[PDB]
């Protein structure tokens, strides 16, 4: 009766879905009772403080458990033959072989081998002792408490901001380019130059001597003079032992390319020059805008003047500032699109260009980080389109958007959905056709009749980047071109000696299996956008339901009439796209994991012969590498992979349980729950015990969300157990 | 039709009971084998669940040519007990022992 | 059975909920002590099986007794104070029943 | 050798894989009498196999390090190096038949729209009209570009929409 | 060294038992 | 006079929320009274509910 | 059941290529296809596919190739029937190919 | 309770009232159609939202229209 304090209509619900929807539309602030736009913005501001405080508390917990139950100081001495430690295990349910099986890494109690990569990230930014990590945990715990105080105090009425303060898009986009991105990257270069560079050279720079230890031996005179090349005179040698001064080097802002020869990682000197350069460019781009000083540029004038005539984009970008600034789901959709793309960018560029010392030797760390940020990017990219669909129902106004790009998008929505349908249908037809063709050829003992289309277009890009394996000799693999010649002192030879190494992940050599699986990835991307764009554009209406905007974003159906309207809502079209999203990210991580397993084992031909046909994916990757996984426990005993043997089944159990909410739908279950209500209300001495919420079955939208949640959790837990065990068992 | 609620409610109960006390035995064995505790499992070398009733029926159907079917020269099959018929070097039929895993799969 | 149900404490209206909770507690105590003491995780030790099977049983009685007061604050014998007296009587009676199970070993 | 490749008549993994398949067929053949019906079919399988290897080496297909023929799907690397029969010739040998079927079905729909009830001649196909459109659809790209020059290929915004 | 033997039963058996209790009592409260 | 289209003229629908928007049917009767939706149009195209006829107003109606 | 039965005894259907059992190697893949294909029908619903059919009926209207028999999405109890039929086919034929490729080889 | 609104596209063929399993709907005099009658929803407290009314409405883009709102013990269709 009380628990949805935000929803007085849910508070009058005598059933048990009062609890389930009090938990589920609690953060849909716009649908709360008595909500105004000012209280909306105030609750969102406090919510962002809560998210920041949780992120800092989480990082401080990582730091504290590494400093306390980990072997970071032991890992610094030997980062190749020592496994990292996440946290100790206190499980009273263990037996003695389980206690003795999880003791490794040089510890005494049972421990977990961390695959989050945090030792490689902390060791390259200057952490060497546990006392450097306790200070970080205490600092981030203090900053998390400060953000909890801030989220409490900016809700207090002397400190509650106005409605007009949140709609200052001009000042926010000024300050979050100049200050939050440029000054922060300049300060991170200040951390790299002052702390990470001398600690990589073996000189301790802590909080006691950073005002007394020069980063450069003639420091701040070449910056004020003009000869900035003095900051790049002596880099680290090719015999540099990391963390010591054996062939150290003295430069702070070098520009080399390629990798450190020991750590197989990016040099910290040109990572410093990287963050310094993009700090300068972010400061220049952040003094572009006109807030309160007369000079700059205005968001109200640039938008409604970029309109091309003669029916090119219609009325162009006329009327967007009334709808970008007023809508939060449009801003959240653009923000999620940007974050989900640059998260895929983080994932693609942290395996090929590993930024951290002794990363890409720890293979399980690399697989976990890639698969982690790729699923994070897949969920964030499907939520970009989800909030883009919430925009068209809740926020879109056609009379405010007369003729702009956002109305022309809805005007030819059928052309968009039909062309995405064509591209997805073409890609699936021919990708499945060539895979089934190669399977039929492998079955009949004739591998030569396979369609093995060579990836010509991407081998040309590798050869234009300097990979001399294919002989296209176009720009950087040609020794006579101008793009080759005008960078031989600047950044090229380390990059050319790093590509042509066939043992890093920097531009792997590719063949017909990589053709087929990049077209599988294109199938997945175009089909996921087919489902998401079709859900965003038909969110307001269709010929089956011309008033879909009248029912809102999430609703079950419109009944059995008009042929039947199961899954008609835009929520239910996000819903079906999460399956194709998990499919797509599963394809990219199957492909990443198996090409890297065959790379790390040595036999890239074992991939190149088997990845051309789906039986080779089934038995040379799934069947083959899940041996030591499933042998985590057996009647002979158990080992340290048994926790991944359990979770691999645990993920198989949640996944199938999702199908119970997916295949069986509500109304079978309400009829079962009514017989259970009968049995409880007619049982002797159980009549005394009576509920407060009337038991009903889960609603239709709720059944979708619960089945999708179990599907995704079982999907992620199965592949995480398989990935970690399959990599860290043989390595 | 006038006590379908009683029928479906008691069958709901016996399905939930059979689900816990059949599949939770497998989850228990998974957990004990994963927690390094193979003695606490449900097996023949552990907590035993012997199918006493089916084993008794196997004994009576193997001893049926003795006194309950006196004109049978052998038992009606070889699964009840005895020797094995071997044809061409391969086993045609041999006796079938029923143990703890047989109990768990029959439930 | 209308005659048999007029005997067990949950239907005896003319008796107090304290004694009702006490008889329910001692009548469930040596019952629920059984599966912890006969087949628990520490069975094959003839010192600790009867100790752990009683300590876990008394903890489960404590869980049920907290859970009764949780039900009593949820729902409101059928009063807010009568169910609290029932919960306290069940705590005392169930721990007494687990101790009585440890006595009759 | 276009992209790290090699001619199949030059590579040795291709010949080793031919000898591997013929070795499997030979040790399979060694069980039977030389004139029996399985041995004739096994030797015919060997003859088709050797003819397949000879005609894949003859057409200049490119093998890889695996010893398997590859397909260069780019004109200008297929036209310049003589690989147009890999993809570039069947990418029009397909599209003639694809636009053929897409034109025959189009004209069968349009020639049955203007009748009493069209749907009865879509479950019960008018076979003389179907075979007339099957034969006279042979010059479909000609008729397709002559229909595109009118604007009678497309339809204007008489089409059915929802709420733009 | 006694911290994982004390904080882990509190966080999993005691403080969720508060959270199974106090967050459940808040559900069925009669609105005044 | 008889307002609306004639007894059997082909017509085009301008109701954007209709199933037969921009789609051609036959007028079968026009009601001559103060009815809001007098023009009765029968279609060969049936809708999702299986109905081939609908009433329309005078502004939602244009010939050919 | 995962290791010693599914993983261990699938070791003859997965390497059956280049033999007479290789059709069992194909159907084991193909029935893994059809089964999962059924999950498109079981999990989704009609009001999605009817609107997708609207968006491609527009494309067939634009190129004058709309059929006179109007494309509809499958019915609710038709899509459930398609899903359960493809689910049963893809599971039973998977087990068919697994069983026969196991037992023709090692039996 | 659910929100059951009707609209002036009603032809008065009273099929939503016969289709209604809960007597939410009833026919009211009106002068916008030939049948001289239009529906009404006086009893939307008893509505469950099962939308049998708008499986029976013949008018294109249905004249009756149920909007699923808050759920009481009558909107959830409970005998308990
Ligand atoms: C990042 C974590 C986070 C943050 C900052 C908030 C923040 C907030 N929640 Mg919230 N919540 C969260 C996670 C979070 N929640 C989770 C995981 C759940 C369970 C699904 C809930 C369930 C929940 C409920 C049920 C309610 C809130 C409410 C609130 C608001 C007080 C505040 C804006 C309350 C609210 O918005 O009412 C004004 C409220 O009633 N939250
Ligand atoms: C220069 C002044 C300044 C600064 C520094 C900030 C800073 C911030 N504001 Mg803010 N603000 C300002 C002025 C400023 N504001 C003004 C003037 C206004 C009024 C117009 C506002 C109005 C405002 C609102 C309304 C909100 C904020 C929010 C925020 C927070 C952003 C959350 C986040 O994580 O993004 C920072 C993101 C990053 C640091 C990561 C991305 C950076 C790159 C591109 C990614 C790749 C590199 C990556 C860092 C590598 C990672 C490696 C390793 C660290 C893992 C942040 C604390 C939000 C918030 O959380 O509320 C407190 C919010 O809702 N501000
Ligand atoms: C916001 C970032 C930041 C901050 C707070 C500092 C702060 C400082 N720097 Mg520093 N520095 C930075 C970025 C930063 N720097 C960058 C980006 C570079 C590379 C160009 C340098 C290169 C640099 C040199 C070469 C020297 C300093 C020095 C100093 C110190 C005295 C400055 C007078 C002071 C601790 C000087 C000093 O006293 O050394 C300790 C000194 O010699 N810094
Ligand atoms: C910056 C990120 C961000 C923000 C602020 C929002 C904010 C919002 N979203 Mg959005 N969304 C996002 C990202 C974001 N979203 C992403 C990435 C996706 C894709 C996954 C979505 C998908 C999405 C949908 C589909 C919907 C929203 C909705 C909403 C609104 C209500 C929030 C709500 O229902 O909370 C309550 C949320 C919950 C109670 C979450 C349920 C629990 C989930 C399933 C996690 C379960 C995992 C489980 C705990 C794992 C445990 C494993 C176990 C074994 C231990 C709110 C405006 C809703 C809306 O606007 O309604 C109209 C809506 O329908 N969003
Ligand atoms: C293995 C399972 C599987 C498969 C094959 C598909 C296949 C497809 N989905 Mg997906 N889908 C799945 C699971 C699957 N889905 C799941 C679990 C969900 C969640 C409910 C979805 C949700 C979903 C949505 C929401 C959408 C799709 C779409 C598509 C289509 C994408 C276009 C394409 O690739 O065409 C290629 C076609 C194929 C790969 C299959 C054809 C198989 C062969 C070639 C047909 C002929 C074989 C043979 C001759 C037939 C003999 C049969 C009989 C006579 C014996 C395609 C039909 C989109 C769509 O319709 O795009 C237009 C779309 O909008 N799907
Ligand atoms: C692996 C997947 C899975 C699982 C576990 C279930 C589970 C169940 N289904 Mg179900 N179902 C599934 C898939 C699954 N289904 C699918 C895919 C479909 C699609 C057609 C259906 C369709 C379906 C129907 C149509 C029916 C069921 C029924 C049932 C129930 C009968 C079993 C029972 O009560 O035993 C007890 C429960 C289990 C065996 C589940 C596992 C519990 C383990 C053994 C121990 C408990 C956990 C332990 C206490 C730890 C808790 C930790 C704590 C933190 C919470 C149960 C809820 C029937 C039902 O509800 O009536 C009885 C019924 O009528 N299901
Ligand atoms: C996806 C588009 C694409 C890409 C990436 C390439 C890529 C390339 N083409 Mg190419 N090409 C394409 C489409 C494409 N082609 C098409 C559609 C045609 C017309 C049929 C051609 C005609 C063509 C010729 C005629 C030539 C190339 C050449 C080249 C190479 C320089 C490089 C490998 C050149 C080459 O051989 O490499 C030096 C060359 O001479 N292309
Ligand atoms: C949250 C984490 C957590 C922790 C720390 C424990 C801790 C324990 N569990 Mg366990 N358990 C948990 C979650 C947890 N459980 C969950 C979620 C489930 C359901 C899936 C189970 C299901 C489970 C079973 C089925 C069994 C255990 C058992 C045990 C005990 C192992 C035997 C041992 O070494 O003690 C040696 C010492 C003893 C056996 C003496 C008894 C100790 C009791 C149980 C302590 C009770 C504390 C206190 C007196 C009462 C609680 C008060 C309350 C306010 C917190 C140990 C006390 C075994 C056991 O004996 O416990 C009953 C057992 O059979 N657990
Ligand atoms: C639903 C919707 C939505 C959403 C949307 C989305 C989600 C989108 C996405 C989008 C995206 C996701 C996009 C992307 C893009 C990308 C791009 C555009 C890229 C670019 C790149 C480039 C251009 C590059 C270049 C280069 C190269 C080529 C290489 C070398 C270097 C250089 C730089 C030169 C919203 C909310 C709005 C609302 C409406 C509707
Ligand atoms: C040629 C062609 C194509 C393709 C196709 C495909 C791609 C297919 C595939 C498919 C797949 C991808 C899969 C499949 C599978 C199948 C199956 C799987 C079947 C089955 C059947 C049956 C009939 C069964 C039976 C049985 C068994 C065996 C077991 C039990 C008993 C029974 C009797 C039930 C294209 C389009 C290009 C063109 C056109 C034509
Ligand atoms: C894909 C899908 C559809 C779309 C499926 C369409 C409607 C049918 C697929 C095409 C069929 C096979 C017709 C195509 C063949 C025609 C007979 C034309 C043949 C032409 C030549 C081959 C002769 C649904 O309608 C549906 C409904 C309810 C739940 C789930 C779903 C669902 O998952």
mmCIF file of N, CA, C and O in Angstrom, chain A residues 13-15 17 545-547 551 558-559 561-562 670 674 677 694-696, chain H residues 50-51 54-55 61-62 65-68 70-73 76-78 80:
data_model
loop_
_atom_site.group_PDB
_atom_site.id
_atom_site.type_symbol
_atom_site.label_atom_id
_atom_site.label_comp_id
_atom_site.label_asym_id
_atom_site.label_seq_id
_atom_site.Cartn_x
_atom_site.Cartn_y
_atom_site.Cartn_z
ATOM 1 N N UNK A 13 -2.581 -1.256 -5.737
ATOM 2 C CA UNK A 13 -2.644 -2.558 -6.381
ATOM 3 C C UNK A 13 -2.594 -3.644 -5.317
ATOM 4 O O UNK A 13 -1.569 -3.780 -4.637
ATOM 5 N N UNK A 14 -3.658 -4.434 -5.138
ATOM 6 C CA UNK A 14 -3.645 -5.468 -4.098
ATOM 7 C C UNK A 14 -2.830 -6.692 -4.457
ATOM 8 O O UNK A 14 -2.630 -7.554 -3.593
ATOM 9 N N UNK A 15 -2.365 -6.801 -5.693
ATOM 10 C CA UNK A 15 -1.686 -7.995 -6.161
ATOM 11 C C UNK A 15 -0.197 -7.918 -5.843
ATOM 12 O O UNK A 15 0.273 -7.010 -5.155
ATOM 13 N N UNK A 17 2.268 -7.842 -8.212
ATOM 14 C CA UNK A 17 3.001 -7.050 -9.191
ATOM 15 C C UNK A 17 3.175 -5.607 -8.753
ATOM 16 O O UNK A 17 3.850 -4.845 -9.456
ATOM 17 N N UNK A 545 -1.236 -0.782 -36.059
ATOM 18 C CA UNK A 545 -1.597 -0.046 -34.851
ATOM 19 C C UNK A 545 -1.217 1.412 -35.034
ATOM 20 O O UNK A 545 -0.112 1.833 -34.671
ATOM 21 N N UNK A 546 -2.115 2.222 -35.602
ATOM 22 C CA UNK A 546 -1.770 3.620 -35.897
ATOM 23 C C UNK A 546 -1.671 4.526 -34.683
ATOM 24 O O UNK A 546 -1.222 5.667 -34.833
ATOM 25 N N UNK A 547 -2.075 4.077 -33.498
ATOM 26 C CA UNK A 547 -1.948 4.912 -32.312
ATOM 27 C C UNK A 547 -1.066 4.266 -31.253
ATOM 28 O O UNK A 547 -1.421 4.246 -30.071
ATOM 29 N N UNK A 551 -0.305 4.396 -26.347
ATOM 30 C CA UNK A 551 -0.154 3.422 -25.277
ATOM 31 C C UNK A 551 1.164 3.572 -24.532
ATOM 32 O O UNK A 551 1.332 2.956 -23.475
ATOM 33 N N UNK A 558 -1.966 -5.205 -28.291
ATOM 34 C CA UNK A 558 -3.275 -4.601 -28.464
ATOM 35 C C UNK A 558 -4.335 -5.694 -28.593
ATOM 36 O O UNK A 558 -5.372 -5.501 -29.229
ATOM 37 N N UNK A 559 -4.078 -6.858 -28.007
ATOM 38 C CA UNK A 559 -5.053 -7.920 -27.953
ATOM 39 C C UNK A 559 -4.946 -8.910 -29.091
ATOM 40 O O UNK A 559 -4.015 -8.868 -29.895
ATOM 41 N N UNK A 561 -7.104 -9.082 -31.537
ATOM 42 C CA UNK A 561 -7.732 -8.554 -32.723
ATOM 43 C C UNK A 561 -6.725 -8.105 -33.753
ATOM 44 O O UNK A 561 -5.534 -7.972 -33.474
ATOM 45 N N UNK A 562 -7.248 -7.889 -34.963
ATOM 46 C CA UNK A 562 -6.484 -7.474 -36.140
ATOM 47 C C UNK A 562 -5.389 -8.485 -36.469
ATOM 48 O O UNK A 562 -4.281 -8.125 -36.867
ATOM 49 N N UNK A 670 -1.223 -18.082 -14.521
ATOM 50 C CA UNK A 670 -2.276 -17.539 -13.674
ATOM 51 C C UNK A 670 -3.297 -18.610 -13.329
ATOM 52 O O UNK A 670 -3.787 -18.671 -12.196
ATOM 53 N N UNK A 674 -3.987 -19.854 -9.520
ATOM 54 C CA UNK A 674 -5.324 -19.909 -8.929
ATOM 55 C C UNK A 674 -5.605 -21.246 -8.245
ATOM 56 O O UNK A 674 -6.234 -21.272 -7.179
ATOM 57 N N UNK A 677 -3.743 -21.009 -5.021
ATOM 58 C CA UNK A 677 -4.512 -20.187 -4.090
ATOM 59 C C UNK A 677 -5.632 -21.000 -3.461
ATOM 60 O O UNK A 677 -5.884 -20.901 -2.252
ATOM 61 N N UNK A 694 -1.910 -10.281 -3.183
ATOM 62 C CA UNK A 694 -2.553 -11.407 -3.843
ATOM 63 C C UNK A 694 -1.621 -11.993 -4.895
ATOM 64 O O UNK A 694 -1.126 -11.255 -5.751
ATOM 65 N N UNK A 695 -1.336 -13.293 -4.845
ATOM 66 C CA UNK A 695 -0.391 -13.889 -5.794
ATOM 67 C C UNK A 695 -0.982 -13.944 -7.192
ATOM 68 O O UNK A 695 -2.017 -14.570 -7.417
ATOM 69 N N UNK A 696 -0.337 -13.252 -8.124
ATOM 70 C CA UNK A 696 -0.657 -13.354 -9.537
ATOM 71 C C UNK A 696 0.604 -13.777 -10.272
ATOM 72 O O UNK A 696 1.713 -13.719 -9.739
ATOM 73 N N UNK H 50 -9.579 -6.893 -21.532
ATOM 74 C CA UNK H 50 -9.349 -8.051 -22.383
ATOM 75 C C UNK H 50 -9.525 -7.752 -23.861
ATOM 76 O O UNK H 50 -9.217 -8.621 -24.683
ATOM 77 N N UNK H 51 -10.058 -6.573 -24.197
ATOM 78 C CA UNK H 51 -10.086 -6.024 -25.552
ATOM 79 C C UNK H 51 -10.922 -6.863 -26.512
ATOM 80 O O UNK H 51 -10.688 -6.838 -27.716
ATOM 81 N N UNK H 54 -12.779 -4.402 -28.925
ATOM 82 C CA UNK H 54 -12.108 -3.924 -30.119
ATOM 83 C C UNK H 54 -11.537 -5.057 -30.956
ATOM 84 O O UNK H 54 -10.707 -4.815 -31.837
ATOM 85 N N UNK H 55 -11.969 -6.286 -30.702
ATOM 86 C CA UNK H 55 -11.941 -7.325 -31.717
ATOM 87 C C UNK H 55 -13.228 -7.353 -32.515
ATOM 88 O O UNK H 55 -13.266 -7.960 -33.588
ATOM 89 N N UNK H 61 -9.563 1.439 -37.919
ATOM 90 C CA UNK H 61 -8.936 2.142 -36.808
ATOM 91 C C UNK H 61 -9.951 2.374 -35.701
ATOM 92 O O UNK H 61 -10.527 3.457 -35.580
ATOM 93 N N UNK H 62 -10.165 1.302 -34.936
ATOM 94 C CA UNK H 62 -11.256 0.946 -34.035
ATOM 95 C C UNK H 62 -11.892 2.111 -33.292
ATOM 96 O O UNK H 62 -11.196 3.009 -32.813
ATOM 97 N N UNK H 65 -11.727 1.725 -27.750
ATOM 98 C CA UNK H 65 -10.285 1.723 -27.551
ATOM 99 C C UNK H 65 -9.997 1.610 -26.065
ATOM 100 O O UNK H 65 -10.332 2.517 -25.300
ATOM 101 N N UNK H 66 -9.374 0.510 -25.663
ATOM 102 C CA UNK H 66 -9.071 0.234 -24.267
ATOM 103 C C UNK H 66 -7.621 0.612 -24.010
ATOM 104 O O UNK H 66 -6.727 0.223 -24.767
ATOM 105 N N UNK H 67 -7.394 1.383 -22.953
ATOM 106 C CA UNK H 67 -6.064 1.809 -22.545
ATOM 107 C C UNK H 67 -5.783 1.188 -21.189
ATOM 108 O O UNK H 67 -6.471 1.498 -20.213
ATOM 109 N N UNK H 68 -4.784 0.313 -21.133
ATOM 110 C CA UNK H 68 -4.509 -0.466 -19.932
ATOM 111 C C UNK H 68 -3.939 0.438 -18.848
ATOM 112 O O UNK H 68 -2.817 0.936 -18.969
ATOM 113 N N UNK H 70 -4.288 1.398 -14.309
ATOM 114 C CA UNK H 70 -4.005 0.782 -13.025
ATOM 115 C C UNK H 70 -4.855 -0.469 -12.843
ATOM 116 O O UNK H 70 -5.927 -0.615 -13.433
ATOM 117 N N UNK H 71 -4.368 -1.380 -12.010
ATOM 118 C CA UNK H 71 -5.024 -2.666 -11.808
ATOM 119 C C UNK H 71 -5.488 -2.780 -10.366
ATOM 120 O O UNK H 71 -4.670 -2.799 -9.442
ATOM 121 N N UNK H 72 -6.799 -2.841 -10.186
ATOM 122 C CA UNK H 72 -7.412 -3.165 -8.912
ATOM 123 C C UNK H 72 -7.643 -4.672 -8.847
ATOM 124 O O UNK H 72 -7.147 -5.433 -9.680
ATOM 125 N N UNK H 73 -8.408 -5.120 -7.855
ATOM 126 C CA UNK H 73 -8.769 -6.526 -7.770
ATOM 127 C C UNK H 73 -9.845 -6.915 -8.768
ATOM 128 O O UNK H 73 -10.037 -8.109 -9.011
ATOM 129 N N UNK H 76 -7.775 -7.039 -12.395
ATOM 130 C CA UNK H 76 -6.956 -8.230 -12.544
ATOM 131 C C UNK H 76 -7.776 -9.492 -12.722
ATOM 132 O O UNK H 76 -7.195 -10.548 -12.985
ATOM 133 N N UNK H 77 -9.097 -9.407 -12.608
ATOM 134 C CA UNK H 77 -9.970 -10.543 -12.822
ATOM 135 C C UNK H 77 -9.788 -11.664 -11.823
ATOM 136 O O UNK H 77 -9.617 -12.822 -12.212
ATOM 137 N N UNK H 78 -9.823 -11.340 -10.538
ATOM 138 C CA UNK H 78 -9.486 -12.293 -9.493
ATOM 139 C C UNK H 78 -10.741 -12.770 -8.782
ATOM 140 O O UNK H 78 -11.593 -11.960 -8.404
ATOM 141 N N UNK H 80 -10.056 -14.272 -6.044
ATOM 142 C CA UNK H 80 -9.445 -14.274 -4.730
ATOM 143 C C UNK H 80 -8.907 -12.895 -4.380
ATOM 144 O O UNK H 80 -8.125 -12.751 -3.442
#
